Design a protein that fits this description.
GO terms for molecular function: DNA binding; sigma factor activity. By secondary structure, the chain is an all-alpha fold. It contains four helices and no strands. Helix 2 crosses helix 3 and helix 3 crosses helix 4. The protein binds one DNA strand of 54 nucleotides through helix 2 and helix 4.
DNA sequence: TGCATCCGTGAAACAGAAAAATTTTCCTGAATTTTGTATAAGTAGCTACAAAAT
């Protein structure tokens, strides 16, 4: 009831990579993945909203997808 | 219900990490020649020799 509760914003992020590559939907997922992870690695004790932390993990997730594939010959993401 | 529309055809992050890989080293081991080396005769040579054709 939180990961989904967010939903939007992650699409505002993923959509930035919908044109970068992969696929709007493809992205969305990826984020989602992240979303999760964040969604729980996350600590309301530091107060400031997940908007300044959830979006972190997202981004991460994503990048690791158009770089992890979307190329049909995987190269050292590094 | 013939008669609408109406499917869809043929033409970009990073630093930090670690862990992998890999890969150079080794070594080694062995396996594998060569050579030594015997080896063992037999030998095919070879060297005089002899009588009898230049």
């Amino acid at each position: 009831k939180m990961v989904q509760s967010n939903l939007r914003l992650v699409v505002s992020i993923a959509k930035k990579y919908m044109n970068r590559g992969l696929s709007f939907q493809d992205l969305i997922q990826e984020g989602s993945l992240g979303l999760i992870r964040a969604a729980e690695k996350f600590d309301h004790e530091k107060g400031y909203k997940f908007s300044t932390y959830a979006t972190w993990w997202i981004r991460q997730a994503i990048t690791r997808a158009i770089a992890d594939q979307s190329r049909t010959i995987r190269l050292p993401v590094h």
